[PDB]
RNA sequence: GUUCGCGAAGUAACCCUUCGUGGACAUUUGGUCAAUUUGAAACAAUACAGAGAUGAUCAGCAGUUCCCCUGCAUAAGGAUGAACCGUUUUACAAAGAGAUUU
């Protein structure tokens, strides 16, 4: 019984309460830094 | 200290030097931090066991977590990374029947 289904999810409140560490990820490097706009 | 201006001495010397004076140039660093225990690292040393499904031997991927580690990492690995199993009583009623106090 050590393996179980999921009752509820790990809430993002618990991730919003943690203070961040600055780990510059390999994909959050700046890229596609221009937003294209439509005609109007 | 350098320079500009003035005075006084050497000195009855427009040369030079000294002394005294006013100005200008120059204007507030460094420390979250003290040099062995007593403001905290963890491994290793001893000893014993020695893995999740059950009859055995195992591949795992997951989930929860007020557990993290190695990792550049949103990859991957850490025993499926580890703890998970443990207790377990009231949103509490209604109908009917008999035995009791008055």
CSV table of N, CA, C and O (backbone and C1' of nucleotides) in Angstrom, one decimal, chain B residues 6-43:
chain,number,residue,atom,x,y,z
B,6,C,P,53.1,92.2,-4.4
B,6,C,O5',53.0,92.4,-2.9
B,6,C,C5',52.1,93.4,-2.3
B,6,C,C4',52.0,93.3,-0.8
B,6,C,C3',53.2,93.5,0.0
B,6,C,O3',53.6,94.9,0.1
B,6,C,C1',52.1,91.6,0.8
B,7,G,P,55.1,95.4,0.3
B,7,G,O5',55.4,95.0,1.8
B,7,G,C5',54.8,95.7,2.9
B,7,G,C4',55.0,95.0,4.2
B,7,G,C3',56.4,94.9,4.8
B,7,G,O3',56.8,96.1,5.4
B,7,G,C1',55.3,92.8,4.9
B,8,A,P,58.3,96.6,5.4
B,8,A,O5',59.1,95.6,6.4
B,8,A,C5',58.7,95.6,7.8
B,8,A,C4',59.3,94.4,8.5
B,8,A,C3',60.8,94.3,8.4
B,8,A,O3',61.4,95.0,9.5
B,8,A,C1',59.9,92.2,7.9
B,9,A,P,62.9,95.6,9.4
B,9,A,O5',63.8,94.3,9.8
B,9,A,C5',65.2,94.2,9.5
B,9,A,C4',65.7,92.8,9.6
B,9,A,C3',66.9,92.5,8.8
B,9,A,O3',68.1,93.0,9.5
B,9,A,C1',65.4,90.8,8.3
B,10,G,P,69.1,94.0,8.8
B,10,G,O5',70.2,93.0,8.1
B,10,G,C5',70.8,92.0,8.8
B,10,G,C4',71.1,90.8,7.9
B,10,G,C3',71.9,91.1,6.7
B,10,G,O3',73.3,91.4,7.0
B,10,G,C1',70.2,89.6,6.2
B,11,U,P,74.0,92.7,6.5
B,11,U,O5',72.9,93.8,6.4
B,11,U,C5',73.1,95.1,6.1
B,11,U,C4',72.1,95.8,5.3
B,11,U,C3',70.6,95.8,5.8
B,11,U,O3',70.0,97.0,5.5
B,11,U,C1',70.7,94.8,3.7
B,12,A,P,69.9,98.2,6.6
B,12,A,O5',70.0,99.5,5.7
B,12,A,C5',70.9,99.6,4.6
B,12,A,C4',70.4,100.5,3.6
B,12,A,C3',71.0,100.3,2.2
B,12,A,O3',70.0,100.6,1.2
B,12,A,C1',71.4,102.5,2.9
B,13,A,P,69.5,99.4,0.3
B,13,A,O5',70.8,98.6,-0.2
B,13,A,C5',71.4,98.9,-1.5
B,13,A,C4',71.3,97.7,-2.4
B,13,A,C3',70.0,96.9,-2.4
B,13,A,O3',69.7,96.5,-3.7
B,13,A,C1',71.8,95.5,-1.9
B,14,C,P,68.4,97.1,-4.4
B,14,C,O5',67.9,96.0,-5.4
B,14,C,C5',67.0,94.9,-4.9
B,14,C,C4',65.9,94.5,-5.8
B,14,C,C3',66.4,94.0,-7.2
B,14,C,O3',65.6,93.0,-7.7
B,14,C,C1',65.0,95.9,-7.4
B,15,C,P,65.8,91.5,-7.2
B,15,C,O5',66.5,90.7,-8.4
B,15,C,C5',67.7,91.1,-8.9
B,15,C,C4',68.8,90.1,-8.6
B,15,C,C3',68.4,89.0,-7.6
B,15,C,O3',67.7,87.9,-8.1
B,15,C,C1',70.6,89.9,-7.0
B,16,C,P,66.4,87.4,-7.4
B,16,C,O5',66.9,86.2,-6.5
B,16,C,C5',67.9,85.3,-6.9
B,16,C,C4',68.7,84.8,-5.7
B,16,C,C3',67.8,84.3,-4.6
B,16,C,O3',67.5,82.9,-4.7
B,16,C,C1',69.4,85.8,-3.7
B,17,U,P,66.1,82.3,-4.1
B,17,U,O5',66.4,82.3,-2.6
B,17,U,C5',67.1,81.2,-2.0
B,17,U,C4',67.5,81.6,-0.6
B,17,U,C3',66.5,81.6,0.5
B,17,U,O3',66.1,80.3,0.9
B,17,U,C1',67.8,83.5,0.8
B,18,U,P,64.6,80.0,1.5
B,18,U,O5',64.6,80.7,2.9
B,18,U,C5',65.4,80.1,4.0
B,18,U,C4',65.4,81.1,5.2
B,18,U,C3',64.1,81.3,5.8
B,18,U,O3',63.7,80.3,6.8
B,18,U,C1',65.2,83.4,5.5
B,19,C,P,62.2,79.8,6.9
B,19,C,O5',61.6,81.0,7.8
B,19,C,C5',62.1,81.3,9.1
B,19,C,C4',61.5,82.6,9.6
B,19,C,C3',60.0,82.7,9.6
B,19,C,O3',59.4,82.0,10.7
B,19,C,C1',60.9,84.6,8.7
B,20,G,P,57.9,81.3,10.5
B,20,G,O5',56.9,82.5,10.4
B,20,G,C5',56.6,83.4,11.4
B,20,G,C4',55.9,84.6,11.0
B,20,G,C3',54.6,84.4,10.3
B,20,G,O3',53.5,84.1,11.1
B,20,G,C1',55.9,86.1,9.2
B,21,U,P,52.3,83.2,10.5
B,21,U,O5',51.5,84.1,9.5
B,21,U,C5',50.8,85.3,10.0
B,21,U,C4',50.4,86.2,8.9
B,21,U,C3',49.4,85.7,7.9
B,21,U,O3',48.1,85.7,8.5
B,21,U,C1',51.1,86.9,6.8
B,22,G,P,47.1,84.4,8.1
B,22,G,O5',46.4,84.9,6.8
B,22,G,C5',45.3,85.9,6.8
B,22,G,C4',45.0,86.3,5.4
B,22,G,C3',44.6,85.2,4.4
B,22,G,O3',43.3,84.7,4.6
B,22,G,C1',46.1,86.7,3.4
B,23,G,P,43.0,83.2,4.3
B,23,G,O5',43.0,83.0,2.8
B,23,G,C5',42.1,83.8,2.0
B,23,G,C4',42.5,83.7,0.5
B,23,G,C3',42.4,82.4,-0.2
B,23,G,O3',41.1,81.9,-0.5
B,23,G,C1',44.3,83.6,-0.9
B,24,A,P,40.7,80.4,-0.3
B,24,A,O5',41.4,79.8,-1.6
B,24,A,C5',40.9,80.2,-2.9
B,24,A,C4',41.9,79.7,-4.0
B,24,A,C3',42.1,78.2,-4.0
B,24,A,O3',41.1,77.5,-4.6
B,24,A,C1',44.2,79.4,-4.3
B,25,C,P,40.7,76.0,-4.0
B,25,C,O5',41.6,75.0,-4.7
B,25,C,C5',41.8,75.1,-6.1
B,25,C,C4',43.1,74.4,-6.6
B,25,C,C3',43.2,73.0,-6.0
B,25,C,O3',42.6,72.0,-6.8
B,25,C,C1',45.2,74.2,-5.6
B,26,A,P,41.2,71.4,-6.3
B,26,A,O5',41.7,70.4,-5.2
B,26,A,C5',42.6,69.3,-5.5
B,26,A,C4',43.0,68.6,-4.2
B,26,A,C3',42.0,68.5,-3.2
B,26,A,O3',41.1,67.4,-3.4
B,26,A,C1',43.9,69.3,-2.1
B,27,U,P,39.5,67.6,-3.5
B,27,U,O5',39.0,67.3,-2.0
B,27,U,C5',39.4,66.1,-1.3
B,27,U,C4',38.7,66.0,0.0
B,27,U,C3',37.2,66.3,0.1
B,27,U,O3',36.6,65.4,1.0
B,27,U,C1',38.4,67.8,1.6
B,28,U,P,35.6,64.3,0.5
B,28,U,O5',35.4,63.3,1.7
B,28,U,C5',36.3,62.3,2.1
B,28,U,C4',36.0,61.7,3.4
B,28,U,C3',34.5,61.3,3.7
B,28,U,O3',34.5,60.1,4.4
B,28,U,C1',35.3,62.8,5.3
B,29,U,P,33.5,58.9,4.0
B,29,U,O5',34.5,57.8,3.5
B,29,U,C5',35.0,57.8,2.2
B,29,U,C4',36.1,56.8,2.0
B,29,U,C3',35.8,55.3,2.3
B,29,U,O3',35.1,54.7,1.1
B,29,U,C1',37.8,55.8,3.3
B,30,G,P,34.0,53.6,1.3
B,30,G,O5',34.6,52.5,2.2
B,30,G,C5',35.5,51.5,1.7
B,30,G,C4',36.2,50.7,2.8
B,30,G,C3',35.3,49.9,3.7
B,30,G,O3',35.1,48.6,3.1
B,30,G,C1',36.6,51.2,5.1
B,31,G,P,33.9,48.3,2.1
B,31,G,O5',33.0,47.2,3.0
B,31,G,C5',32.3,47.7,4.1
B,31,G,C4',32.6,46.9,5.3
B,31,G,C3',31.4,46.7,6.2
B,31,G,O3',30.5,45.6,5.8
B,31,G,C1',33.2,47.4,7.5
B,32,U,P,29.3,45.9,4.8
B,32,U,O5',28.0,45.3,5.5
B,32,U,C5',27.6,45.7,6.7
B,32,U,C4',26.9,44.6,7.5
B,32,U,C3',27.9,43.4,7.8
B,32,U,O3',27.6,43.0,9.1
B,32,U,C1',26.0,42.7,6.7
B,33,C,P,28.6,43.3,10.4
B,33,C,O5',29.8,42.4,10.1
B,33,C,C5',29.7,41.0,9.9
B,33,C,C4',31.0,40.3,9.6
B,33,C,C3',32.3,41.1,10.1
B,33,C,O3',33.2,40.2,10.5
B,33,C,C1',32.4,40.8,7.7
B,34,A,P,33.4,39.9,12.1
B,34,A,O5',34.6,40.9,12.4
B,34,A,C5',35.8,40.8,11.7
B,34,A,C4',37.0,40.4,12.5
B,34,A,C3',37.1,38.9,12.9
B,34,A,O3',38.4,38.5,13.0
B,34,A,C1',37.0,40.3,14.9
B,35,A,P,39.4,38.8,11.8
B,35,A,O5',40.3,37.4,11.8
B,35,A,C5',39.8,36.2,12.3
B,35,A,C4',40.9,35.4,12.8
B,35,A,C3',40.5,34.4,13.9
B,35,A,O3',41.3,33.2,13.9
B,35,A,C1',42.0,36.0,14.8
B,36,U,P,40.7,31.7,13.8
B,36,U,O5',39.6,31.7,15.0
B,36,U,C5',39.8,31.3,16.3
B,36,U,C4',39.6,29.8,16.4
B,36,U,C3',39.2,29.4,17.8
B,36,U,O3',37.9,29.7,18.3
B,36,U,C1',40.8,27.9,17.0
B,37,U,P,36.5,29.2,17.7
B,37,U,O5',36.2,27.9,18.5
B,37,U,C5',35.4,26.8,17.9
B,37,U,C4',35.4,25.6,18.8
B,37,U,C3',34.1,25.6,19.7
B,37,U,O3',33.7,24.3,19.8
B,37,U,C1',36.1,25.5,21.0
B,38,U,P,32.3,23.8,19.3
B,38,U,O5',31.3,25.0,19.6
B,38,U,C5',30.7,25.1,20.9
B,38,U,C4',30.1,26.5,21.0
B,38,U,C3',30.9,27.7,20.5
B,38,U,O3',30.0,28.7,20.1
B,38,U,C1',30.6,27.9,22.8
B,39,G,P,30.5,29.7,18.9
B,39,G,O5',29.3,29.7,17.9
B,39,G,C5',29.0,28.6,17.1
B,39,G,C4',27.7,28.8,16.3
B,39,G,C3',27.7,29.9,15.3
B,39,G,O3',26.9,29.5,14.2
B,39,G,C1',25.9,30.2,16.8
B,40,A,P,27.6,29.0,12.8
B,40,A,O5',27.4,27.4,12.8
B,40,A,C5',28.4,26.6,13.4
B,40,A,C4',27.9,25.3,13.8
B,40,A,C3',27.2,24.5,12.7
B,40,A,O3',27.5,23.1,12.8
B,40,A,C1',25.8,24.6,14.6
B,41,A,P,28.5,22.4,11.7
B,41,A,O5',27.5,21.4,10.9
B,41,A,C5',26.4,21.9,10.2
B,41,A,C4',26.5,21.6,8.7
B,41,A,C3',26.7,20.2,8.4
B,41,A,O3',25.4,19.5,8.3
B,41,A,C1',28.3,21.4,7.2
B,42,A,P,25.1,18.4,9.4
B,42,A,O5',25.4,17.0,8.7
B,42,A,C5',24.8,16.7,7.5
B,42,A,C4',25.8,16.2,6.5
B,42,A,C3',26.5,14.8,6.8
B,42,A,O3',25.7,13.7,6.4
B,42,A,C1',28.2,16.4,6.4
B,43,C,P,25.8,12.3,7.1
B,43,C,O5',27.2,11.7,6.6
B,43,C,C5',27.3,11.3,5.2
B,43,C,C4',28.8,11.1,4.8
B,43,C,C3',29.5,10.0,5.4
B,43,C,O3',29.3,8.8,4.6
B,43,C,C1',30.8,11.9,5.6
